[PDB]
Structure formats: structure tokens, C-alpha cells
């Protein structure tokens, strides 16, 4: 069996949500359409949030599983306000490798830019140290 270790590192080039503030961003991770849904903290008033948060998500089938990453602005009267999202196929990560890179979030309709998000992703067997190359 395999575990998905995802470090939601940081994002940049976020849009200004509304005329007062910059952005109060957090990310949501979801495996497939399952109840494995995780949320980062909110970083207030910045276009360059750094979360550096690790999540450990059991995988069902590395050949077909998908990770959706949603970037949203904290609720200010209208529920969490969507910014952008990306759907990442798990089968593109070589097993055991710690893959650190940037992803281009697709802005939702009405949002002026989607931001870019840095994720460090490691698919490993149970018992392997998360975020270290699995020999």
C-alpha cells in the first residue's frame, strides 16, 4: 500500500480579492471525490503565502488516483471564495521520489489570475520516511 505525502509549501502571484485587502489564502486538498479533504491555515493579507504544511493521505490506486488542489480566499460573508484549482494525476509521480515543483492554478471564472503554488509530493510505502527519497 502507498501513502501520499503532500507538503503545501507556498504560493505566489495571487489576485487581489476585493478593493480593500490583498488575499487571505488557504488551500484545500482532495483525493479523488472522496472525504479525504484537508485544509491549510489561512495566511492573512498577502499575495505570497507560505504555509509549509504537511499532509499524509492514504492512496487507493496510484495508477488512477487524482489530487485536486483548490486555492480559496477566507470567507468574508459569501462562504470560502474560490480563486483557482488544479487536478493533478498521482500516476505522474515516480514512486519514492520527492518531487518539488510549481503548479499553475487555473483561475475560476471572474478571477483575474490564478496564482502559482509550490507542492512537494512524495508517494511512498508505509514505513518509509516521508519526504525523503525511498531507496
The Cα–Cα gap between 8 and 99 comes to 12
| Cα gap 123→114, rounded to integer Å | 26
Resolution (A): 1.4
The experimental method is X-ray
Domains annotated on the chain, with CATH:
2-125 (2.60.40.150)
Q: Are 93 and 121 in contact (CB under 8 A)?
A: yes
Following DSSP, what letter does each residue of 89-110 receive, concatenated?
A: EGGGS-TT-EEEEEEEPEEPTT
Least Cα distance to 59 among 79, 89, 86, 80 occurs for 89
Terminal C-alpha separation, the chain: 16
Q: How far is CA 135 from CA 92, 97, 129, 132, in A?
A: 19, 9, 10, 9
Distance CA(64)–CA(118), nearest Å, equals 22
Amino acid at each position: 500500500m502507498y501513502q501520499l505525502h503532500v507538503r503545501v509549501v507556498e504560493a505566489k502571484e495571487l489576485p487581489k480579492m476585493d478593493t480593500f485587502g490583498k488575499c487571505d489564502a488557504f488551500a484545500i486538498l482532495q483525493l479523488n471525490s472522496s472525504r479525504n479533504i484537508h485544509r491549510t491555515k489561512v495566511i492573512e493579507k498577502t499575495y505570497t503565502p507560505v504555509w509549509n504544511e504537511e499532509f499524509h493521505i492514504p492512496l487507493e490506486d496510484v495508477t488512477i488516483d487524482t489530487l485536486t488542489v483548490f486555492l480559496k480566499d477566507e470567507d468574508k460573508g459569501s462562504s470560502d471564495d474560490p480563486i483557482s484549482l488544479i487536478k493533478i494525476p498521482i500516476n505522474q509521480f515516480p514512486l519514492g521520489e520527492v518531487v518539488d515543483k510549481w503548479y499553475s492554478l487555473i483561475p475560476v471564472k471572474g478571477v483575474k489570475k490564478g496564482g502559482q503554488i509550490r507542492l512537494t509530493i512524495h508517494i511512498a510505502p508505509l514505513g518509509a520516511t516521508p519526504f525523503q527519497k525511498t531507496d
